[PDB]
């Protein structure tokens, strides 16, 4: 199953492999750009990129979805916020008091799905 | 606490958020560059960038570590191989038959620690 293992010591400043998120969005999610890699189509407007600082991670996240992704918003453990971007369709699902680890999904001309890997607190 | 949740529908082509890895290495790990972002110092030599192909992922990995990261090697489900890069310090830790989902860690002037998130098959 899903698991996590740490290697090394205690020094240094923390970093996350999930380093930046942007979206293209209109009334729905046309694309998500994860660490600079584009996933989806070219519709909508390109949001400015959210780039995480050291020790910063998504701690709350609302995704509206139906047969596709309609809307994304999140807040980090530092209190910074992204979105909401997208429209009011689908229905909202919220992750509360989490640490998002990775954002995978599926995309074509639009953002069909997201697979969110996170730690639940 | 580590889990995952899927939102949205069935369409599109799958994508993974972890897309490329390079390292700076000498007798140990000086830096890791994940999805294009540099974490760590300026010592050692910069490795070529390993860019994951469509549907490719780390399936087997060895990390040598003590108080820092001493060496990294991995192999993928497409038979590709990365490293070993680094030295002989620390102790070997081996992941067998996995799918690496994400790499977090900690770095200053060197690579202090790695947090590997993976599915264990
Ligand atoms: O988000 C779906 C759709 O929303 C609006 O119609 C416009 O912004 C389009 O460009 C976009 O494709
Ligand atoms: O998610 C795409 C689309 O899927 C379904 O048709 C409904 O939930 C809509 O409200 C939503 O906009
Ligand atoms: O992403 C919207 C849509 O784009 C393309 O038509 C295909 O990839 C579909 O599978 C996908 O559902
Ligand atoms: O990797 C640890 C260390 O190895 C060698 O001594 C050199 O390449 C250094 O620049 C590097 O920092
Ligand atoms: O990890 C850096 C360093 O940490 C400890 O001192 C020992 O495990 C060494 O063998 C190792 O090289
Ligand atoms: O990365 C090696 C070393 O570099 C810097 O001195 C600091 O970030 C330390 O915490 C770290 O252990």
UniProtKB/Swiss-Prot annotation, chains A, B:
Disulfide bonds: none annotated. Residues 2-120 form the Jacalin-type lectin domain. Gene3D superfamilies: Jacalin-like lectin domain. Coiled coil: none annotated. Pfam families: Jacalin. The keyword Nucleotide-binding does not apply. Keywords: Lectin, Mannose-binding. GO terms for molecular function: carbohydrate binding; D-glucose binding; D-mannose binding; identical protein binding; N-acetylgalactosamine binding. Mixed specificity lectin with anti-HIV activity. Binds to HIV envelope glycoproteins, including exterior membrane glycoprotein gp120, and inhibits viral entry into cells. Binding to gp120 is dependent on gp120 being glycosylated, and is inhibited by mannose, glucose and N-acetylglucosamine. Belongs to the jacalin lectin family. This is Griffithsin. It comes from Griffithsia sp. (strain Q66D336) (Red alga).
């Amino acid at each position: 199953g899903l698991t996590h293992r740490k290697f090394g010591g205690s020094g240094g400043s923390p970093f996350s492999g999930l380093s930046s998120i942007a979206v293209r969005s209109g009334s729905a999610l046309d694309a998500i750009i994860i660490d600079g890699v584009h996933h989806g189509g070219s519709g909508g407007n390109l949001s400015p990129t959210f780039t995480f600082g050291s020790g910063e991670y998504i701690s709350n996240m609302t995704i509206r979805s139906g047969d596709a992704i309609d809307n994304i918003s999140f807040e980090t453990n530092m209190g910074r916020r992204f979105g909401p971007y997208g429209g009011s369709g689908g229905s909202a699902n919220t992750l509360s008091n989490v640490k998002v680890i990775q954002i995978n999904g599926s995309a074509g001309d639009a953002l069909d799905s997201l697979d969110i890997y996170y730690e639940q607190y």
